Amino acid sequence: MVNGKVALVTGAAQGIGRAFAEALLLKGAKVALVDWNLEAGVQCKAALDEQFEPQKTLFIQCDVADQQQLRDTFRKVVDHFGRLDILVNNAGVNNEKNWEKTLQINLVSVISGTYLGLDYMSKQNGGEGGIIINMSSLAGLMPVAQQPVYCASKHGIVGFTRSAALAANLMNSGVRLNAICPGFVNTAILESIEKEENMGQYIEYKDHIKDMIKYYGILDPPLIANGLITLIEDDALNGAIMKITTSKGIHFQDY
Amino acid sequence: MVNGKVALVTGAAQGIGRAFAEALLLKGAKVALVDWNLEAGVQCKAALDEQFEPQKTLFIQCDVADQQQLRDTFRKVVDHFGRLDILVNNAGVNNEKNWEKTLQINLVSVISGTYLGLDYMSKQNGGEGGIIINMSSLAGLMPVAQQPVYCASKHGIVGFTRSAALAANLMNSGVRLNAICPGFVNTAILESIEKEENMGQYIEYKDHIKDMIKYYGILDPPLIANGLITLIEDDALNGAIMKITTSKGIHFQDY
Ligand SMILES: NC(=O)C1=CN([C@@H]2O[C@H](COP(=O)(O)OP(=O)(O)OC[C@H]3O[C@@H](n4cnc5c(N)ncnc54)[C@H](O)[C@@H]3O)[C@@H](O)[C@H]2O)C=CC1
Ligand SMILES: NC(=O)C1=CN([C@@H]2O[C@H](COP(=O)(O)OP(=O)(O)OC[C@H]3O[C@@H](n4cnc5c(N)ncnc54)[C@H](O)[C@@H]3O)[C@@H](O)[C@H]2O)C=CC1
Ligand SMILES: Cn1ccc2cc(-c3cnc4ccc(C(=O)N5CCCCC5)cc4n3)ccc2c1=O
Ligand SMILES: Cn1ccc2cc(-c3cnc4ccc(C(=O)N5CCCCC5)cc4n3)ccc2c1=O
């Protein structure tokens, strides 16, 4: 069940994040959208208000790269609603010129948010348990030539997820950690490859990514949401890596 | 071959780095030791001077985390031996309490050093070619419960190496990138898993990894040097993952 549970989704004003938020609110959940984009977040919240209830959503503007901001955002989330049951970490960028910030946002922020969610969720620290869902890509399971740091960040995310799952199992925290790896999703992050200001030296080789995209296909963000509702609804699923593609669909990386 | 080539090996004051430096100097290559430990580097340099020629070693104190020092160390290394031919990125600290520093030292520093090596080594830019070998662990392709962020860093190293190999093949830089994934190697980093000021919250489960170490045995740093020499000697090896264990031995991750 999801009804009555509090969900905290990072970067949920557009793309996959807002699809996750819509799915969670459809199943019934008080949802906190945190995002560093003020206008995008306000527009997303005002759109979600029209079909859902006004009081089941809460927008917070914060940069997940900052640590004090993330801690204070978690403080506001748990203060407003009251608890925390689902934590989805999907705030990624495709900047290769400033790859340091890309690594700080994709990987460091994921681990920091996971630790904060364990702080506010683990039974040892006081809580009932829950789920923490980390969003990686198939780049975390296979190499991508035109974006090395993004591949490294996704690999780090998947490794950290499938190790922290075993850790949390050992610590009796009651928190189950799973990772979601989509293929290509029709979002804005897909048009970033076409620009050199966040691609840099690899802007000359952006055609290979387009060829791969055409060969495989493009996934609707709603379908990705069906993955999130599938891991949450299953209690006996800890550390499993969800893979979403076109031909196969929603399956798992049998390790 | 490395009969007269120049190698920048990282973290060569002690442990695996010292074995790499000894092997390379035995083969005939000038070696630039880099370390953040003044005394540990000075003693290693004195020993290597007493063994090999005085002029084939150059010790430079630098913290690989600091970007300015790292780019101001490559400058002196290339301003001393003239060229750069081998780049061994080997600098890992196990510290889960300050996991931000661990991530910065293990993953960010390796990527920055690889980018500097491509800047100073790519055939199209001003160079001739060479090899960049990033040191990883078997935890780079397996989950480890008692150290999640270390697993994430190693997964990032593996993914970045695998992707950057294809990238460098695509840009015609002539630089070959490979990664090494040893098992348990008898060094001074295994004593850090028995320290609560170094492992933090996972110090109650160090027995689980100690059981694994006793089970798979331990490895001699000379074997990792043999693996490095095997990687460098073969010109048809780009992106191959180097696995060293005690039963199979030196072999490759067949992806
Ligand atoms: N869209 C795709 O085709 C794929 C995306 N993913 C992953 O899904 C995640 C999100 O999906 P996208 O398609 O990229 O959506 P997107 O284009 O909407 O980008 C994610 C959103 O997160 C927010 N965000 C970014 N950096 C942030 C930060 N530092 N602090 C707070 N909020 C921040 C922004 O609102 C941004 O629009 C990313 O981590 C991405 O790597 C996974 C596989 C493929
Ligand atoms: N020893 C083992 O059993 C395993 C080790 N490794 C890898 O080997 C490396 C560790 O070397 P070991 O010989 O095992 O032990 P070690 O800890 O003695 O070697 C690492 C050395 O690197 C240097 N170093 C650390 N941080 C630095 C920094 N920021 N700047 C400059 N120098 C720095 C220090 O001199 C340090 O002693 C790591 O890269 C680790 O991932 C891989 C698999 C298992
Ligand atoms: C059957 N099959 C087999 C292989 C396969 C591989 C991929 C596949 C392969 N490289 C990828 C590299 C990067 C990303 C990614 O995160 N991006 C894109 C760029 C913008 C940022 C967001 C996704 C990828 N996705 C997708 C589908 C299939 C597939 O359906
Ligand atoms: C046949 N076989 C099969 C599996 C296997 C697994 C490992 C194996 C399994 N977890 C590992 C986890 C971490 C590290 C590591 O980097 N540390 C240790 C801690 C201090 C920092 C440095 C190495 C590991 N090494 C080793 C050998 C075999 C092996 O020989």
XYZ file of C-alpha atoms and ligand atoms in Angstrom:
658
model
C 0.000 0.000 0.000
C 0.969 3.644 -0.536
C -2.107 5.377 0.874
C -1.275 7.782 3.682
C 2.488 7.550 3.182
C 4.792 10.538 2.704
C 6.948 10.623 -0.429
C 9.917 12.951 -0.951
C 11.024 13.186 -4.592
C 14.102 15.203 -5.512
C 13.902 17.287 -8.672
C 10.213 16.707 -9.382
C 9.146 19.763 -11.383
C 9.547 18.244 -14.867
C 10.493 15.040 -16.620
C 10.607 11.726 -14.792
C 10.322 13.319 -11.352
C 6.915 14.855 -11.966
C 5.720 11.567 -13.471
C 6.758 9.846 -10.239
C 4.953 12.535 -8.246
C 1.775 12.151 -10.302
C 1.835 8.364 -9.909
C 2.400 8.571 -6.150
C -0.391 11.109 -5.673
C -2.665 8.950 -7.832
C -2.072 6.019 -5.495
C -2.543 8.373 -2.534
C 0.453 9.995 -0.866
C 1.518 13.326 0.588
C 4.344 14.313 -1.748
C 7.174 16.819 -1.321
C 8.599 18.169 -4.587
C 12.056 19.641 -3.984
C 13.742 21.393 -6.893
C 16.217 24.220 -7.417
C 14.032 25.678 -10.204
C 11.586 28.078 -8.564
C 9.407 28.788 -11.596
C 9.332 25.196 -12.852
C 8.494 23.920 -9.378
C 5.739 26.488 -8.886
C 4.218 25.628 -12.271
C 4.404 21.888 -11.561
C 2.788 22.335 -8.143
C 0.017 24.511 -9.579
C -0.622 21.893 -12.269
C -0.688 19.010 -9.777
C -3.058 21.031 -7.579
C -5.756 21.139 -10.267
C -6.340 17.377 -10.412
C -5.153 16.363 -6.922
C -5.760 17.814 -3.497
C -4.014 21.094 -2.626
C -2.800 19.837 0.761
C -1.123 16.621 -0.448
C 1.752 18.421 -2.185
C 4.537 20.658 -0.905
C 7.123 22.479 -3.020
C 10.565 23.290 -1.601
C 13.262 25.121 -3.572
C 16.674 23.695 -2.721
C 19.917 22.727 -4.435
C 20.611 19.083 -3.624
C 24.334 19.736 -4.130
C 24.361 21.908 -1.006
C 24.460 19.876 2.203
C 23.068 22.418 4.669
C 20.250 23.148 2.221
C 19.482 19.432 1.886
C 19.435 18.918 5.658
C 17.163 21.917 6.181
C 14.901 20.745 3.345
C 14.533 17.356 5.021
C 13.788 19.232 8.243
C 10.957 21.148 6.562
C 9.611 18.004 4.876
C 9.415 16.005 8.102
C 8.124 19.017 10.058
C 5.260 19.809 7.677
C 3.815 16.362 6.979
C 5.134 14.445 9.978
C 6.949 11.330 8.766
C 8.840 10.001 5.746
C 8.131 6.703 3.992
C 9.312 6.966 0.362
C 12.458 8.763 -0.814
C 13.124 9.078 -4.553
C 16.456 10.580 -5.633
C 16.250 11.746 -9.263
C 18.107 15.019 -9.813
C 20.673 14.572 -12.576
C 22.458 16.839 -15.039
C 24.329 16.164 -18.276
C 27.057 18.810 -18.002
C 30.403 17.450 -19.193
C 32.232 20.782 -19.388
C 31.628 21.331 -15.659
C 31.941 17.644 -14.840
C 32.806 18.398 -11.203
C 29.319 19.794 -10.611
C 27.823 16.874 -12.546
C 29.581 14.417 -10.233
C 28.581 16.440 -7.164
C 24.913 16.494 -8.208
C 24.481 13.000 -9.653
C 26.500 10.923 -7.171
C 27.385 12.882 -4.018
C 23.856 14.238 -3.634
C 22.370 10.751 -4.034
C 24.504 9.347 -1.209
C 23.839 12.362 1.016
C 20.093 12.071 0.459
C 20.210 8.329 1.100
C 22.010 8.883 4.403
C 19.554 11.612 5.420
C 16.617 9.367 4.546
C 18.142 6.591 6.633
C 18.523 9.112 9.460
C 14.836 10.037 9.278
C 13.527 6.547 8.412
C 15.608 3.791 10.026
C 14.015 2.111 13.029
C 17.263 2.540 14.967
C 17.022 6.332 14.697
C 13.263 6.208 15.296
C 10.845 5.393 12.510
C 8.795 2.714 10.802
C 11.030 1.968 7.809
C 10.188 2.577 4.173
C 11.861 2.606 0.774
C 14.653 4.702 -0.739
C 14.718 4.636 -4.544
C 17.830 5.799 -6.393
C 17.553 6.709 -10.075
C 20.429 5.603 -12.310
C 20.523 4.872 -16.034
C 21.541 1.999 -18.261
C 24.789 3.965 -18.457
C 25.302 2.595 -14.953
C 25.346 -0.924 -16.420
C 27.071 -0.296 -19.774
C 29.684 2.187 -21.010
C 28.773 5.339 -22.911
C 31.479 6.939 -25.029
C 30.286 10.544 -25.291
C 29.717 11.206 -21.561
C 32.279 9.562 -19.269
C 31.516 11.395 -16.018
C 27.796 10.667 -16.376
C 28.642 6.980 -16.819
C 30.866 7.100 -13.733
C 28.158 8.791 -11.662
C 25.530 6.235 -12.687
C 27.930 3.367 -11.963
C 28.596 4.847 -8.537
C 24.866 5.208 -7.923
C 24.105 1.578 -8.781
C 27.036 0.260 -6.748
C 26.149 2.399 -3.737
C 22.509 1.317 -3.943
C 23.201 -2.406 -4.141
C 25.744 -2.168 -1.313
C 23.683 0.036 1.016
C 20.841 -2.443 0.542
C 22.960 -5.158 2.168
C 24.154 -2.682 4.799
C 20.598 -1.706 5.767
C 19.658 -5.386 5.828
C 22.465 -5.975 8.331
C 21.585 -2.958 10.496
C 17.892 -3.938 10.924
C 16.868 -0.472 9.752
C 13.809 -1.829 7.940
C 14.602 0.346 4.909
C 14.771 -1.304 1.482
C 16.932 0.303 -1.203
C 16.412 -0.262 -4.928
C 17.663 1.454 -8.075
C 15.801 2.269 -11.291
C 17.631 2.302 -14.644
C 15.561 3.524 -17.612
C 16.700 3.606 -21.212
C 15.972 6.799 -23.137
C 13.100 8.857 -21.717
C 11.368 11.684 -23.594
C 12.431 14.516 -21.296
C 14.380 17.763 -21.554
C 17.681 16.124 -20.567
C 17.625 14.519 -24.021
C 18.055 17.864 -25.831
C 21.170 18.670 -23.777
C 23.338 16.355 -25.900
C 22.733 18.695 -28.847
C 24.454 21.622 -27.078
C 28.205 22.020 -26.617
C 27.872 24.230 -23.528
C 27.241 21.106 -21.435
C 28.898 18.541 -23.745
C 32.289 20.123 -24.383
C 34.945 18.038 -26.094
C 32.451 15.325 -27.087
C 30.101 17.668 -28.977
C 31.676 16.382 -32.205
C 30.529 12.811 -31.441
C 26.903 13.461 -30.453
C 25.696 11.576 -33.542
C 26.428 8.146 -32.047
C 24.023 8.823 -29.175
C 21.341 9.864 -31.666
C 21.916 6.692 -33.686
C 21.557 4.592 -30.528
C 18.402 6.491 -29.526
C 16.854 5.822 -32.926
C 17.894 2.166 -32.848
C 16.436 1.450 -29.400
C 13.559 3.906 -28.982
C 12.123 6.434 -26.565
C 10.222 5.684 -23.361
C 7.256 7.641 -22.061
C 7.892 8.968 -18.526
C 4.567 7.490 -17.302
C 5.908 3.998 -17.999
C 8.905 4.799 -15.792
C 6.415 5.627 -13.038
C 5.012 2.103 -13.367
C 8.435 0.918 -12.245
C 8.349 3.046 -9.096
C 4.941 1.670 -8.077
C 6.249 -1.855 -8.712
C 9.217 -1.740 -6.326
C 7.220 0.000 -3.589
C 4.307 -2.448 -3.733
C 6.709 -5.397 -3.326
C 8.131 -5.869 0.167
C 10.458 -8.728 -0.848
C 12.548 -6.573 -3.199
C 15.721 -5.122 -1.675
C 18.796 -4.285 -3.725
C 17.159 -5.432 -6.958
C 18.058 -3.276 -9.961
C 15.055 -2.359 -12.101
C 15.697 -2.059 -15.845
C 13.245 -0.308 -18.166
C 13.755 -0.666 -21.920
C 11.559 -0.830 -25.011
C 11.690 -4.408 -26.303
C 11.864 -6.237 -22.964
C 10.066 -3.771 -20.711
C 10.182 -3.673 -16.916
C 12.614 -6.380 -15.803
C 15.600 -6.926 -13.496
C 19.375 -7.196 -13.778
C 19.935 -10.788 -12.649
C 23.299 -10.504 -10.909
C 57.756 -1.038 -23.989
C 58.934 1.152 -21.104
C 62.685 1.022 -21.719
C 62.994 4.809 -21.617
C 59.460 6.032 -20.999
C 58.276 8.365 -18.234
C 55.658 7.188 -15.739
C 53.690 9.240 -13.212
C 52.481 6.790 -10.565
C 50.190 8.140 -7.857
C 50.421 7.185 -4.195
C 53.834 5.565 -4.589
C 55.076 6.212 -1.044
C 53.929 2.801 0.204
C 51.877 -0.246 -0.672
C 50.743 -1.003 -4.212
C 52.151 2.262 -5.555
C 55.618 1.398 -4.282
C 55.402 -1.972 -6.041
C 54.351 -0.237 -9.265
C 57.267 2.182 -8.997
C 59.737 -0.625 -8.292
C 58.504 -2.677 -11.251
C 58.595 0.279 -13.644
C 62.074 1.317 -12.502
C 63.257 -2.277 -12.882
C 61.986 -2.286 -16.461
C 63.773 1.007 -17.097
C 61.265 3.857 -16.917
C 61.770 7.134 -15.090
C 59.147 7.460 -12.367
C 57.557 10.504 -10.723
C 56.261 9.597 -7.267
C 53.397 11.780 -6.050
C 52.082 11.618 -2.491
C 50.609 13.805 0.226
C 52.902 12.212 2.848
C 56.274 13.951 3.026
C 58.117 11.404 5.161
C 56.542 8.305 3.610
C 57.544 9.603 0.183
C 61.033 10.659 1.244
C 61.805 7.227 2.704
C 60.499 5.473 -0.417
C 62.576 7.776 -2.625
C 65.672 7.088 -0.525
C 65.115 3.331 -0.792
C 64.592 3.501 -4.559
C 67.700 5.681 -4.889
C 69.653 3.068 -2.940
C 68.271 0.422 -5.321
C 67.944 2.066 -8.752
C 69.617 5.086 -10.324
C 69.258 8.392 -8.444
C 68.048 10.285 -11.523
C 65.191 7.945 -12.491
C 63.032 8.938 -9.500
C 61.385 12.249 -8.694
C 59.231 12.760 -5.602
C 56.654 15.563 -5.584
C 54.435 16.217 -2.567
C 50.880 16.949 -3.684
C 47.313 16.261 -2.596
C 45.433 14.745 -5.529
C 42.179 16.180 -4.154
C 43.433 19.733 -4.732
C 42.898 20.610 -8.395
C 45.447 23.431 -8.421
C 48.196 21.268 -6.913
C 47.397 18.369 -9.250
C 47.742 20.534 -12.370
C 50.811 22.198 -10.836
C 52.357 18.747 -10.291
C 51.946 17.488 -13.855
C 53.633 20.740 -14.872
C 56.775 19.975 -12.867
C 56.782 16.313 -13.907
C 56.681 17.206 -17.611
C 59.122 20.079 -16.972
C 61.619 17.588 -15.508
C 61.590 14.398 -17.591
C 60.363 16.165 -20.742
C 57.461 13.870 -21.640
C 54.722 11.782 -20.043
C 54.086 8.225 -21.221
C 52.429 6.174 -18.446
C 49.862 7.506 -15.968
C 49.011 5.237 -13.033
C 46.160 6.784 -11.035
C 46.366 4.944 -7.701
C 45.226 6.906 -4.649
C 42.543 5.437 -2.418
C 41.597 6.145 1.175
C 39.054 4.046 3.069
C 37.103 6.508 5.220
C 33.334 6.127 5.541
C 32.964 8.706 8.320
C 34.150 11.501 6.011
C 32.743 9.835 2.911
C 32.767 13.142 1.014
C 36.560 13.244 1.248
C 36.746 9.565 0.289
C 34.667 10.209 -2.834
C 36.750 13.271 -3.714
C 40.036 11.373 -3.345
C 38.988 8.122 -5.042
C 36.706 9.087 -7.943
C 36.974 12.832 -8.620
C 40.767 12.837 -8.386
C 41.135 9.865 -10.743
C 38.951 11.537 -13.379
C 40.823 14.831 -13.033
C 44.172 13.060 -13.334
C 42.961 11.154 -16.387
C 41.875 14.414 -18.015
C 45.259 15.978 -17.234
C 46.998 12.938 -18.707
C 44.943 13.175 -21.883
C 45.805 16.880 -22.038
C 49.531 16.125 -21.756
C 49.565 12.857 -23.726
C 46.993 12.829 -26.541
C 48.686 12.392 -29.907
C 46.453 14.934 -31.638
C 47.168 17.620 -29.039
C 50.949 17.638 -28.738
C 51.943 14.187 -27.558
C 52.700 10.707 -28.849
C 50.351 8.367 -26.940
C 50.731 6.155 -23.924
C 48.678 4.328 -21.321
C 46.534 5.558 -18.432
C 45.788 2.851 -15.863
C 43.257 3.647 -13.140
C 43.506 1.485 -10.031
C 40.172 0.081 -8.867
C 39.085 -2.806 -6.646
C 37.094 -5.992 -7.063
C 34.445 -4.053 -5.145
C 34.242 -2.068 -8.375
C 32.204 -4.949 -9.781
C 30.836 -6.540 -6.580
C 28.759 -5.088 -3.735
C 30.409 -4.680 -0.338
C 28.121 -4.200 2.649
C 30.447 -2.538 5.164
C 31.726 0.236 2.893
C 29.097 1.631 0.496
C 30.794 4.847 -0.623
C 34.033 2.987 -1.384
C 32.011 0.610 -3.564
C 30.393 3.594 -5.286
C 33.778 5.193 -5.945
C 35.192 1.971 -7.395
C 32.128 1.446 -9.586
C 32.610 4.996 -10.828
C 36.258 4.268 -11.617
C 35.326 1.146 -13.582
C 32.587 2.886 -15.551
C 34.691 5.961 -16.281
C 37.619 3.840 -17.467
C 35.443 1.656 -19.696
C 33.735 4.676 -21.259
C 36.856 6.838 -21.617
C 38.639 3.993 -23.396
C 36.046 4.074 -26.181
C 36.104 7.877 -26.124
C 39.888 8.056 -26.560
C 39.647 5.459 -29.315
C 37.094 7.738 -30.995
C 39.121 10.975 -30.728
C 42.276 9.370 -32.226
C 44.249 10.485 -29.170
C 46.300 7.282 -29.184
C 45.981 6.928 -25.401
C 44.972 3.511 -24.068
C 42.920 3.322 -20.873
C 42.682 0.197 -18.722
C 41.646 -0.568 -15.153
C 42.945 -2.934 -12.477
C 40.640 -4.669 -9.980
C 42.709 -6.568 -7.400
C 41.213 -8.646 -4.634
C 42.578 -8.304 -1.106
C 46.189 -7.094 -1.239
C 48.403 -7.172 1.845
C 49.062 -3.466 2.445
C 48.505 -0.843 5.138
C 44.898 -0.195 4.051
C 43.576 -3.427 5.585
C 44.330 -2.162 9.097
C 41.922 0.750 8.503
C 38.859 -1.542 8.556
C 39.404 -2.044 12.305
C 39.054 1.621 13.268
C 35.785 3.300 14.245
C 37.312 6.719 13.493
C 37.971 5.421 9.969
C 34.910 3.227 9.261
C 32.396 5.187 11.340
C 28.962 3.582 11.538
C 30.003 0.273 9.907
C 32.506 -0.683 12.628
C 30.085 -3.204 14.161
C 30.276 -5.431 11.058
C 34.007 -5.482 10.267
C 33.970 -9.173 11.209
C 31.959 -9.946 8.070
C 34.662 -8.573 5.764
C 37.432 -10.001 7.958
C 35.859 -13.425 7.426
C 35.982 -12.848 3.658
C 39.640 -11.756 3.767
C 40.625 -14.884 5.695
C 38.654 -16.969 3.200
C 40.018 -15.614 -0.100
C 43.529 -15.207 1.298
C 45.768 -12.195 0.699
C 47.780 -10.932 -2.265
C 51.364 -9.641 -2.566
C 51.879 -6.173 -4.095
C 54.414 -7.659 -6.557
C 51.514 -9.469 -8.257
C 49.728 -6.173 -8.906
C 52.969 -4.855 -10.409
C 53.057 -7.924 -12.661
C 49.514 -7.100 -13.735
C 50.530 -3.510 -14.480
C 53.481 -4.669 -16.584
C 51.236 -7.096 -18.467
C 48.726 -4.315 -19.165
C 51.381 -1.886 -20.410
C 53.276 -4.405 -22.545
C 50.218 -5.335 -24.637
C 49.292 -2.687 -27.203
C 45.964 -4.336 -28.116
C 44.301 -3.747 -24.752
C 41.885 -0.811 -24.496
C 39.188 -0.771 -21.832
C 40.024 -4.255 -20.559
C 39.318 -4.773 -16.855
C 42.162 -6.427 -14.946
C 41.112 -8.892 -12.236
C 43.721 -10.314 -9.856
C 42.678 -13.021 -7.399
C 44.458 -15.894 -5.667
C 42.766 -18.793 -7.497
C 42.326 -17.663 -11.105
C 45.190 -15.182 -10.942
C 45.567 -12.472 -13.571
C 42.537 -12.520 -15.873
C 40.002 -10.214 -17.509
C 36.369 -9.263 -16.945
C 34.743 -10.662 -20.098
C 31.897 -8.210 -20.646
N 15.550 11.284 -19.280
C 16.246 10.226 -19.672
O 16.193 9.827 -20.843
C 17.064 9.554 -18.665
C 17.111 10.117 -17.440
N 17.529 9.414 -16.364
C 17.768 10.094 -15.096
O 16.538 10.567 -14.600
C 16.791 11.707 -13.746
C 15.781 12.794 -14.023
O 15.209 12.606 -15.334
P 15.535 13.593 -16.518
O 15.122 13.013 -17.807
O 17.009 13.983 -16.421
O 14.691 14.892 -16.161
P 14.888 16.468 -16.266
O 15.308 16.878 -17.617
O 13.601 17.118 -15.772
O 16.023 16.744 -15.217
C 15.860 16.390 -13.829
C 15.369 17.585 -13.054
O 15.961 17.580 -11.742
C 16.088 18.910 -11.268
N 17.450 19.103 -10.783
C 18.614 18.948 -11.488
N 19.698 19.192 -10.792
C 19.213 19.531 -9.538
C 19.852 19.901 -8.339
N 21.178 19.995 -8.200
N 19.074 20.176 -7.271
C 17.748 20.085 -7.401
N 17.037 19.745 -8.476
C 17.829 19.481 -9.518
C 15.682 19.853 -12.409
O 14.366 20.349 -12.202
C 15.750 18.939 -13.635
O 14.820 19.339 -14.635
C 18.255 12.101 -13.959
O 19.047 11.718 -12.842
C 18.652 11.328 -15.220
O 20.026 10.958 -15.198
C 17.728 8.071 -16.461
C 17.829 7.483 -17.642
C 17.645 8.198 -18.928
N 45.253 -2.966 -0.567
C 44.196 -3.651 -0.985
O 43.924 -4.759 -0.502
C 43.381 -3.042 -2.032
C 43.791 -1.851 -2.515
N 43.324 -1.374 -3.690
C 43.646 -0.014 -4.103
O 44.999 0.251 -3.782
C 45.129 1.605 -3.291
C 45.589 1.579 -1.859
O 46.987 1.230 -1.833
P 47.531 0.126 -0.859
O 48.846 -0.343 -1.310
O 46.462 -0.958 -0.721
O 47.610 0.887 0.536
P 47.927 2.364 1.036
O 46.770 2.977 1.711
O 49.200 2.294 1.873
O 48.246 3.111 -0.302
C 47.604 4.359 -0.631
C 48.605 5.475 -0.478
O 48.249 6.558 -1.357
C 48.715 7.779 -0.815
N 47.638 8.758 -0.880
C 46.371 8.641 -0.373
N 45.612 9.688 -0.584
C 46.437 10.556 -1.283
C 46.235 11.846 -1.805
N 45.087 12.519 -1.704
N 47.268 12.434 -2.448
C 48.420 11.769 -2.555
N 48.728 10.552 -2.102
C 47.689 9.995 -1.471
C 49.233 7.499 0.602
O 50.654 7.489 0.618
C 48.656 6.113 0.902
O 49.505 5.371 1.769
C 43.764 2.250 -3.501
O 43.681 2.854 -4.786
C 42.824 1.054 -3.385
O 41.608 1.288 -4.075
C 42.555 -2.161 -4.491
C 42.015 -3.279 -4.034
C 42.256 -3.802 -2.668
C 17.405 -3.724 -25.889
N 18.276 -2.638 -25.470
C 19.585 -2.834 -25.404
C 20.464 -1.831 -25.010
C 19.917 -0.559 -24.669
C 20.752 0.518 -24.258
C 20.189 1.746 -23.927
C 21.082 2.906 -23.498
C 22.417 2.898 -23.895
N 23.211 3.900 -23.545
C 22.712 4.933 -22.806
C 23.566 6.015 -22.428
C 23.061 7.069 -21.674
C 21.719 7.071 -21.290
C 21.168 8.232 -20.458
O 21.046 8.112 -19.290
N 20.789 9.487 -21.085
C 20.888 9.781 -22.549
C 21.650 11.074 -22.826
C 21.098 12.214 -22.065
C 21.044 11.929 -20.616
C 20.242 10.663 -20.340
C 20.888 6.016 -21.656
C 21.407 4.932 -22.432
N 20.577 3.906 -22.785
C 18.809 1.926 -24.012
C 17.993 0.873 -24.414
C 18.569 -0.386 -24.745
C 17.744 -1.470 -25.160
O 16.358 -1.302 -25.242
C 37.462 -16.200 -6.280
N 37.102 -14.926 -5.680
C 35.835 -14.535 -5.677
C 35.435 -13.326 -5.118
C 36.436 -12.495 -4.535
C 36.105 -11.244 -3.942
C 37.103 -10.453 -3.388
C 36.745 -9.117 -2.741
C 35.452 -8.947 -2.256
N 35.111 -7.802 -1.678
C 36.034 -6.805 -1.558
C 35.670 -5.571 -0.937
C 36.608 -4.551 -0.814
C 37.905 -4.736 -1.295
C 38.932 -3.609 -1.161
O 39.192 -2.939 -2.099
N 39.596 -3.341 0.104
C 39.374 -4.096 1.377
C 39.018 -3.168 2.536
C 39.993 -2.068 2.695
C 40.198 -1.322 1.436
C 40.607 -2.257 0.306
C 38.259 -5.936 -1.904
C 37.294 -6.986 -2.031
N 37.658 -8.160 -2.628
C 38.427 -10.889 -3.398
C 38.751 -12.111 -3.979
C 37.729 -12.920 -4.554
C 38.049 -14.175 -5.148
O 39.373 -14.623 -5.172
